[PDB]
Design an enzyme around this catalytic site. Structure first.
Site, mmCIF file in Angstrom:
data_model
loop_
_atom_site.group_PDB
_atom_site.id
_atom_site.type_symbol
_atom_site.label_atom_id
_atom_site.label_comp_id
_atom_site.label_asym_id
_atom_site.label_seq_id
_atom_site.Cartn_x
_atom_site.Cartn_y
_atom_site.Cartn_z
ATOM 1 N N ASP A 47 -8.590 34.423 -9.325
ATOM 2 C CA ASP A 47 -8.864 35.032 -10.625
ATOM 3 C C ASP A 47 -7.767 36.002 -11.044
ATOM 4 O OD1 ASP A 47 -11.706 34.367 -9.475
ATOM 5 O OD2 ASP A 47 -11.917 34.646 -11.693
ATOM 6 N N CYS B 38 -16.611 28.535 -4.316
ATOM 7 C CA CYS B 38 -16.789 28.561 -5.766
ATOM 8 C C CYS B 38 -16.506 27.190 -6.385
ATOM 9 C CB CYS B 38 -15.891 29.619 -6.424
ATOM 10 S SG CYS B 38 -16.605 30.287 -7.959
#
Ligand SMILES: Nc1nc2c(ncn2[C@@H]2O[C@H](COP(=O)(O)O)[C@@H](O)[C@H]2O)c(=O)[nH]1
Ligand SMILES: Nc1nc2c(ncn2[C@@H]2O[C@H](COP(=O)(O)O)[C@@H](O)[C@H]2O)c(=O)[nH]1
Ligand SMILES: Nc1nc2c(ncn2[C@@H]2O[C@H](COP(=O)(O)O)[C@@H](O)[C@H]2O)c(=O)[nH]1
Ligand SMILES: Nc1nc2c(ncn2[C@@H]2O[C@H](COP(=O)(O)O)[C@@H](O)[C@H]2O)c(=O)[nH]1
Ligand SMILES: O=C(COP(=O)(O)O)[C@H](O)[C@H](O)COP(=O)(O)O
Ligand SMILES: [K+]
Ligand SMILES: [K+]
Lengths: 322, 322, 322, 322, 322, 322
Positions: free
Chosen positions: B202, B133
């Site tokens: 996250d 990511c």
């Protein structure tokens, strides 16, 4: 040498992957040598032999990793070499090659249907199968299971960079088989719901390793982690002779632009290299069964398949060399 | 009822992933509460309080998985609610809201710098780092390790479907750091040359699990297999307080068209389902350290972070709740 | 049509587990074909052949999982069918049937002795051996190791639901071998003092998996965890030939009342389901050696046993089939 | 009864490890059988047969663990015994023993050369190689690979107690190969930088386990842990045929003074026992390949090597017994 | 000392397991000390203290393994000891003890309901849960999940030797929850279909280990193997103080006749010992979460629970000693 | 500038390893700080402060890897520096340094005694214990356990290159404990008969990794493999506070002559590099417990030890810096 159009056209189409999948590449290679011998305007056997040697060299120098290709050429040309060297006249050589290539193609077609029948018995009604890339041998297993009335669902991984997973998804859906399409990254996330993993092979080595589409070793890795069976549907011509005597299979690096298109990659900084390996190596421990046209084997029995079918030819040079 | 336009735009942009990355989403949400309070036309505290609740709700119903978002809203709204209930006048409430937002934002920037300084000590000259990511926290570590004069090289995974790898690659390249860019499937194939893995987060749960971009679990899985350190760069506001009382973190299912574009997907038959999980869960046995702004911890000490900073709040309903 | 009473009694007794253990069931089935042929009143070969087919069918539809049973029936019926189709007269057929049965029975007894002699070499003075169920093949090994003057001690698991552990315990005790008797759940708790595990097999598959009494997989699992050798004592007729072409072995589901007696179970509500699998599958990674009458092999060489002795027969339908 | 002193010199020099390494020992035992036959003063054939039987027993009772030795004596004495029993006169017997010795010795040298050529193909340019003990077959692989122009370095573990690692270190340096020399305990620490592990073998068993120098199993364990390939360079006469029938390989326990010298050890208390095992047992799950002179196998295929090369001999007694 | 009937009756019922389950044993122990203080005819405080000391000794010397028991006595008697030593008059002491025991019992009852609520959030609709033994804490989780309308099915293991699994099956079925009943041996066989494992605890150690019913370590072992979550529902009084300073928890060996009834065991040979351990030790690596009344923790945070709740009392002797 | 020769003698004797073991080194560094203060001829407080700052730097730059040393200097110099900055006159400063030194030294002796008592409770009668290097804290555990009447034997690995194992072997024998002495490479071979592993530590990190003598990690690895408990005996001053902020522990590389003596090494070729790492890093997944003087922890709780004991000191510079 008087080489035909179709030898060249086939070779470009193997390189550009317009023709792809290890089985198909191997049939197409044999088909091309068939068309050489049909159309050769040669007069002498020595002349035809030379054409077929060279046409073979052209075809071998296309894509390196799937040993199916050289096994197909070897099949046609061990025979053509034996014919020629017992002074076969012209038409005897032309038929050796044409008929040899017809056998290989028939046997490929037969072996695949057979792998479908064997592998489908290892599939149970209700199974969610995860697959990778597009493998005719794997699809044969899945399709056959579905025709047996087992209610299955296949998770297709898209298979970057070239999207072979689109082919697999549309194909399977068109035989009526419900497909779940996901990105290669989601394999572990969805391994919990998966009952079986079914994939193809390009090369299988003496010690049991499976070279298949990039990402295969990952899917097998996490499949083992969850105790989902990993079944590799693979024809005996997927097995790699030179690995008996210590050869490392070459891993095909393809063009950077398969990953990042040209229009975008040319704008990117010089200090970024795009690496595009086309295949990786799944070790045998992550494989449960290899399903061949001759039956289920453990992967450590790949050396048995190679001894009984390829051992003899390794003291001989390649049958297109001189 | 009287919600400013910047709140609505910010929520639209979090939904659309125009604004993305856990840390940035958290800051963007604080900002949006800041601006609501700056520009309010309320006369009574009860009216401003009512706007800040509704604006909070709208911001929270954008994206579920990154807990940074509701942790940011809480840092503002816990403080705003205690002021309102302490009788604060209009302007005292307005300023609690503005100044709370500003503190969160300032702490988010300092924390990421500090994570960078701390994590960079674990990077060594010559290292090859795989990431996944685009994570600001991970990049902070790599950036700082390069500025310290360590010759690092970063393997960057493209991160399908939304291609955050591209963002990472251009960024790292821009600081002078060389990059090797690969598809997600190639992560195991290149783990053998990787020295460290460095990703973000996250949400981080009580028991030590890291919820991060789809594919993170796979990369950590084969990192472990290979004995490559997995380092998660993550701010304390990435920790998930609801999970201490057994909440499962929702995995955001995003639109199928992120995977297969609209034009194409409309051509596909009903019986293909595209599934787009945006996150997966990496178990703590595959993580070696979490690098927070308050230092290195093993993943199992996630609970200590949660206890000492967030536990207090779990007897109460949510700060924006009626 | 004209089936003797000993066939029917033998099938009733295999069903009921009055006659049990893979090896013994195989011998009992040969015997039953023997007696059918001894006592037949047939006048034409076609009539005797018809009786031996029907008696074969009845014997086979008793218990699915131990492949020893149909391997015994085949050893008789392959030979009986080849004689009938070679025109054999009544008495030649009668004798092929009787003498084939007698050979199988004689080979089953010699094989178990030989397995004993071979396996006992792997037992050392002082060893502590865990076993499971009652297996004649396993007991042969322990018995012989004791007669050689090795001071062994055997941990015996009770083997619910049918309590075969009790049979094992009394037997081993009767030869002078000390026994530690424990419930199945305690197997991991005592693995730390165990030196060897020695169990039997009902079916062994192409890829190396051992199907044996329910719980065997657990014992092998924690044996591996502990680095304790798992040795499977097993005759070549325990190997499953259908599995080379991908057959899954049926796991026999036996009566709920074996678990919970009739009186009690009738008092239980509808929404409890009692499930009684009599076998489980132990994967080959948890087995170290299989000890057959022809020697020690690693489990992956199950395929070599199957190829060299049973492969020939898989182009044909079943010897008792019309 | 009339034994030449060369037989006794050899046997002494094998005990004291002046002659060492499984291959060299084997060659040296055949050499002594050869010299016994050349220099014999026997006038009847029966009298020579008796000197060779006896020479064989003197040679076998030197060092138990390396099967190479008895497999060498076997090669000679199977043939000497077949000649003798077929009426062979004196000079026919003498020659049979000399020419069998000479065959085994030429075969050994050729086998090792060929292992070097097969094994070098598995070493890639750049590689770092860890090894253990001093193995003539492992060194062949490392030497050929360097001769092929590949730039390798070799991590030579010192191999206590007898310091074999020093022989290996000087030898490899002498061919121009850079060496890293470390203590045995440093194996795991340096396994991260190691790409391949290459070691010898004293015996290899029916199920694939490798017996080699004490420490070999520790190196293979942490190598597996880190996914470094473990390659065993082993002539086919290292494979142990008694193990097909269940035999355990004896682990030679050598003198405590090899560990702590005589001078020092006599001062130590009685209640310190010094234990010097000279070999350990590496399981096959930690070996990726065995490189023999007939090719690469997975460790599970040792049983195939044994079946085809040595299984014939097991139903007979030993070749030097009365 | 004037000890009441109910102290003795309770102690016999803990020993015979008429009262069982670690929670219940602990409540019953506290209840018994409550009834002592209600009924004591003592005149002096010193007299009552002596009664309660001795009644406690009686109760502690019943069953050793579940630390819940001594934690309950400690709870009542740390307080009673503090009261007495600040010269509390008689009725002040009598109330300290009565009220202390009422708190422990209320808190046990509350903690269990709470563990139900927390743990049920970790259960998803459709889940198949496997459990072991009969645990009120585990059942609270499962029952609560079912009352939330999640459609669950529980696999109850019968739990030899004492059949606690019958209790679990009938109980759960009576709240409407579909139950699948199986033997302890079938745990691995059915682990593939299982989504979550939920079990209780008797003692939990400082380093994270869970002592629970014999067979627990097996179920957790194979659960980890398949990546099914292992959740241990356990009250903070299940945690074991003395393990902070290096105590091994005693494993209760119960009477042989629990396994083999007396009528049969007396007929068995002398050389068979029946071993009946009542509990085993599941290491922390096979545990995902421990759910306590204070929330989800990783098992390595058991030392945090013990430090914050029990650390203080370990420099003091036991509060019933002198 | 005016440094007493005792400081220099100590520093020399730490470099040459005449003073060795992490505890003893620490005590010896405080002892030298103590003697510097006692024997100082400084007439101003500032002048003594300067001699101690300098003595500290001389002592710290001896051996980097054992944090015990700088943690000892820290104990003294935090306090000497707090005194100095609070105006303390000469004789107040001198005493603060002497009494701090004396406190640390008494605490060290008491910590080790208490580790012995906590750790012995984990040794059971019968046990066989493997150890590595010579560790005063590991020996305390083994000694107390023997003093308690438990019959143990200890496997003492020789610990190359510097032969620490001989110190351990003679010492344990001297208390009447039977020793088995083996080379480092024999660790796995003998791990089957080993019940517990007990070793020391030089540093322990925030995430639970233990740095100890080269080889420690190999022993912990095969110990985990075999499910033998690995117990680390470590005083709290072995825990490394720089590692909370991301620091890597330096691995001392000592002289090549410790491996191969000077006489011999000079004859060896230039192209043999001898590498002597003196420590390695054992990950926390292979450590079951750390026994400190405040109790048993799982390795993950090292961060708790560090937070509570040393975290205060990290925002300040080092105590001996200008
Ligand atoms: N799926 C999931 N697992 C979670 C969550 N919070 C914590 N966990 C923990 O994360 C781990 C994931 O394990 P896995 O099933 O990936 O092997 C488990 O131990 C689970 O208990 C959550 O929100 N979702
Ligand atoms: N369940 C099952 N597995 C079988 C059978 N024959 C072979 N196998 C193999 O046995 C292994 C069992 O793996 P498991 O699922 O227990 O982890 C698999 O590799 C599977 O392919 C059979 O009849 N049933
Ligand atoms: N120790 C030992 N194991 C042997 C021998 N021959 C074969 N083996 C096999 O080698 C493996 C030893 O693995 P380990 O006990 O080191 O984990 C087992 O599978 C065992 O059955 C022998 O002579 N000694
Ligand atoms: N090598 C090393 N690892 C450390 C150090 N401090 C902490 N660690 C941690 O210890 C572990 C090392 O495991 P290994 O690499 O041996 O498999 C990793 O989790 C790493 O993050 C240090 O100074 N050196
Ligand atoms: O091991 C048992 C029962 O032991 P026994 O039946 O031998 O007493 C239970 O799992 C725990 O005690 C927890 O039960 P609860 O959660 O009800 O305390
Ligand atoms: K490596
Ligand atoms: K052990």
């Amino acid at each position: 040498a008087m080489i035909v159009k179709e030898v060249y056209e086939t070779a470009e189409k193997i390189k550009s992957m317009e023709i792809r999948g290890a089985g198909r590449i191997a049939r197409a290679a044999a088909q091309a040598l068939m068309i050489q011998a049909e159309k050769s305007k040669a007069k002498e056997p020595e002349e035809l032999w030379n054409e077929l040697k060279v046409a073979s060299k052209i075809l071998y120098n296309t894509r390196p990793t799937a040993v199916s290709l050289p096994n197909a050429l070897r099949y046609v040309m061990h025979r053509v070499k034996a014919a020629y060297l017992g002074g076969a006249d012209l038409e005897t050589l032309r038929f050796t090659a044409i008929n040899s290539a017809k056998e290989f193609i028939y046997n490929s077609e037969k072996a695949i249907e057979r792998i479908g029948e064997i592998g489908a018995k290892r599939i149970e009604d209700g199974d969610i199968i995860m697959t990778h890339c597009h493998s005719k041998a794997a699809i044969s297993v899945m399709k056959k299971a579905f025709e047996q009335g087992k209610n299955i669902k296949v998770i297709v991984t898209e298979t970057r960079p070239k999207w072979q997973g689109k082919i697999t998804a549309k194909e399977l859906a068109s035989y009526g088989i419900p497909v779940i399409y996901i990105v290669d990254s989601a394999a572990r996330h969805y391994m919990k719901m998966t009952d079986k993993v079914v994939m193809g092979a390009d090369s299988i080595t003496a010690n049991g390793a499976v070279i298949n589409k990039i990402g295969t070793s990952l899917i097998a890795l996490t499949a083992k982690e969850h105790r989902v069976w990993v079944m590799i549907a693979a024809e005996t011509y997927k097995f790699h002779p030179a690995t008996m005597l210590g050869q490392l299979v070459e891993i095909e690096m393809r063009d950077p632009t398969e990953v990042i298109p040209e229009e975008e990659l040319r704008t990117w900084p010089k200090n970024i290299e795009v690496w595009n390996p086309a295949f990786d190596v799944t070790p045998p421990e992550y494989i449960d069964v290899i399903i061949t046209e001759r039956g289920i084997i453990p992967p450590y029995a790949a050396i048995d398949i190679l001894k009984e079918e390829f051992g003899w030819a390794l003291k001989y040079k390649e049958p297109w060399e001189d």
